[PDB]
Amino acid sequence: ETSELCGGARICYIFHETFGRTLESVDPLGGLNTIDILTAIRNATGPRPAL
Amino acid sequence: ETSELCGGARICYIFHETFGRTLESVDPLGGLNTIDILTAIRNATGPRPAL
């Protein structure tokens, strides 16, 4: 019966138009505050000195 | 007795003038909404992608 997308290709839709796009919206630079990162890498060094 | 067509060739009539014509009136493009068909073939593909 011709109707709303369901059953089969609706899941295809879920795995592309929904899911694929959803992931495309994520970050890739999200959370990357330069200054906070500079702090983070200072923390990564820790108690020692670094070259 | 010469009268209304009956008995024999009346059935011939049924199998041609009635039946044959009746079938000739059916479709052949009936129900074929291009857009609904496009939906149908998307359904025919189902959850997978298609080439």
From Swiss-Prot, chains A, B:
Q: Which residues cross the membrane?
A: none
Mutation effect (residue 7 to D): In EMPF1; uncertain significance; unable to associate with MIEF2 into filaments forming the tubular structures that wrap around the scission site; presence of concentric cristae and/or increased dense granules in some mitochondria
Give tissue specificity per the record: Ubiquitously expressed with highest levels found in skeletal muscles, heart, kidney and brain. Isoform 1 is brain-specific. Isoform 2 and isoform 3 are predominantly expressed in testis and skeletal muscles respectively. Isoform 4 is weakly expressed in brain, heart and kidney. Isoform 5 is dominantly expressed in liver, heart and kidney. Isoform 6 is expressed in neurons.
Cell compartment(s), UniProt: Cytoplasm, Cytosol; Golgi apparatus; Endomembrane system; Mitochondrion outer membrane
User: What's noted about post-translational modification?
Assistant: Phosphorylation/dephosphorylation events on two sites near the GED domain regulate mitochondrial fission. Dephosphorylated on this site by PPP3CA which promotes mitochondrial fission. Dephosphorylated by PGAM5.
Q: Which family does it belong to?
A: Belongs to the TRAFAC class dynamin-like GTPase superfamily. Dynamin/Fzo/YdjA family.
What the entry says about domains is: The GED domain folds back to interact, in cis, with the GTP-binding domain and middle domain, and interacts, in trans, with the GED domains of other DNM1L molecules, and is thus critical for activating GTPase activity and for DNM1L dimerization.
Q: How does it assemble?
A: Homotetramer; dimerizes through the N-terminal GTP-middle region of one molecule binding to the GED domain of another DNM1L molecule. Oligomerizes in a GTP-dependent manner to form membrane-associated tubules with a spiral pattern. Interacts with GSK3B and MARCHF5. Interacts (via the GTPase and B domains) with UBE2I; the interaction promotes sumoylation of DNM1L, mainly in its B domain. Interacts with PPP3CA; the interaction dephosphorylates DNM1L and regulates its transition to mitochondria.
Q: What illness does the record link it to?
A: May be associated with Alzheimer disease through amyloid-beta-induced increased S-nitrosylation of DNM1L, which triggers, directly or indirectly, excessive mitochondrial fission, synaptic loss and neuronal damage.
Role this protein plays: Functions in mitochondrial and peroxisomal division. Mediates membrane fission through oligomerization into membrane-associated tubular structures that wrap around the scission site to constrict and sever the mitochondrial membrane through a GTP hydrolysis-dependent mechanism. The specific recruitment at scission sites is mediated by membrane receptors like MFF, MIEF1 and MIEF2 for mitochondrial membranes.
Question: Per its record, how is this protein called by name?
Answer: Dynamin-1-like protein
Task: From the UniProt record, report the name of the gene that encodes this protein.
Answer: DNM1L
Which part of the full protein is shown? 356 to 406 of 736
